Design an enzyme around this catalytic site. Structure first.
Site, short mmCIF file in Angstrom:
data_model
loop_
_atom_site.label_atom_id
_atom_site.label_comp_id
_atom_site.label_asym_id
_atom_site.label_seq_id
_atom_site.Cartn_x
_atom_site.Cartn_y
_atom_site.Cartn_z
N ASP A 131 66.26 48.81 17.60
CA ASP A 131 65.89 47.97 16.46
C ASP A 131 65.13 48.81 15.43
O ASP A 131 64.01 48.51 15.03
CB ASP A 131 65.06 46.78 16.92
CG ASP A 131 64.89 45.72 15.84
OD1 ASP A 131 65.72 45.68 14.91
OD2 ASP A 131 63.93 44.93 15.92
N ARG A 135 60.25 46.84 10.03
CA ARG A 135 59.33 45.98 10.75
C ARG A 135 58.77 46.65 12.00
O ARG A 135 57.79 46.14 12.56
CB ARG A 135 60.03 44.68 11.15
CG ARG A 135 61.23 44.89 12.05
CD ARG A 135 61.91 43.59 12.41
NE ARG A 135 63.24 43.84 12.97
CZ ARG A 135 64.33 44.03 12.24
NH1 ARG A 135 64.28 44.00 10.92
NH2 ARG A 135 65.50 44.26 12.84
N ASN A 136 59.35 47.76 12.44
CA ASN A 136 58.89 48.47 13.63
C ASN A 136 58.30 49.83 13.30
O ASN A 136 58.17 50.68 14.19
CB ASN A 136 60.04 48.61 14.63
CG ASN A 136 60.51 47.27 15.14
OD1 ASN A 136 59.72 46.36 15.35
ND2 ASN A 136 61.82 47.15 15.36
N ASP A 149 58.37 52.12 19.25
CA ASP A 149 59.59 52.08 20.05
C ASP A 149 59.42 51.39 21.40
O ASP A 149 60.30 51.53 22.26
CB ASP A 149 60.13 53.51 20.26
CG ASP A 149 59.18 54.38 21.07
OD1 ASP A 149 58.16 53.86 21.58
OD2 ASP A 149 59.46 55.59 21.20
#
Length: 266
Positions: A131, A135-136, A149
């Site tokens: 992903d 946003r990460n 992660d």
């Protein structure tokens, strides 16, 4: 500081809540009464134990300036703590939407480079990010971007495929082999990195803002792609566009993308 494996719960004081992540709530905390930390709190059932014991015993040990640094875990009971470094400027997505209008294009390119450097390091350990999106990612005091992660990695040997079964992440960041063939490749996160580049130069706009997941899958299969961001030059768009090739075998590696972005830095 470095990943120490298991930590003592009593040596972690919780100060405030940073927000609710995908696998549980994340709280601000003080560790050893000295270090600021972020603490993911996983309720029982909200996470696969197999994934946790695999990630804790391989991924978490990987320390890199562009990856969120893991300090340890508290896994004797539930809720399991995942303790990482605290990042003073928070989520990249929020930062782009709040302070993006004041950032120069060279800084936006620098953010993409940071993410590319960290992802090139995971790639060298045969891990993909399931992903990879704004946003990460987190922004530190120097506007350096770090990739988070946890619970989003998967071991994939180069040029090989694996099943995409597992947590379903937003498909607007997923490659054709993911939503069509239910497979990850060693370059599925390369596709997502192109979407990330679009986020960065769009100052946090939602890709395919006016279209639903079913419409995006259909039109990506038909060759349509995201448009050139307002703040992206022709050359920078050429880089992110190359991440969006239908065939994984024709996408570049993060190492190749690393060498393409370096000449464009300030």
């Amino acid at each position: 500081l470095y990943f120490q494996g298991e930590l003592k719960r009593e040596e972690i004081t919780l100060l405030k809540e940073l927000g609710s992540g995908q696998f549980g709530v994340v709280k601000l905390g003080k560790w050893k009464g000295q270090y600021d930390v972020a603490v993911k709190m996983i309720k029982e059932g909200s996470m696969s134990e197999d994934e946790f014991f695999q990630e804790a015993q391989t991924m978490m040990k990987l320390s890199h300036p562009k990856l969120v640094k893991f300090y340890g875990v508290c896994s004797k009971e539930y809720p399991i703590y995942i303790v990482t470094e605290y990042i003073s400027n928070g989520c990249l997505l929020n930062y782009l939407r709040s302070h993006g209008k004041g950032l120069e294009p060279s800084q936006l390119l620098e953010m993409c480079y940071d993410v590319c450097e960290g992802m090139a390091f995971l790639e060298s350990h045969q891990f993909i990010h399931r992903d990879l999106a704004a946003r990460n990612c987190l922004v530190d005091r120097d506007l350096c971007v770090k990739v988070s992660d946890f619970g989003m990695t998967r071991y994939v040997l180069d040029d090989q495929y694996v099943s995409s079964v597992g947590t379903k992440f937003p498909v607007k960041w997923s490659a054709p082999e993911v939503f069509h063939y239910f497979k990850y490749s060693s370059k599925s996160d390369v596709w997502a990195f192109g979407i990330l580049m679009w986020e960065v130069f769009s100052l946090g706009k939602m890709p395919y803002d006016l279209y639903t997941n079913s419409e995006v899958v259909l039109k990506v299969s038909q060759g349509h792609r995201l448009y050139r961001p307002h703040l992206a030059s022709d050359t920078i768009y050429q880089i992110m566009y190359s991440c969006w090739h239908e065939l994984p075998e024709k996408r570049p590696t993060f190492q190749q993308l690393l060498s393409s972005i370096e000449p464009l830095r300030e």
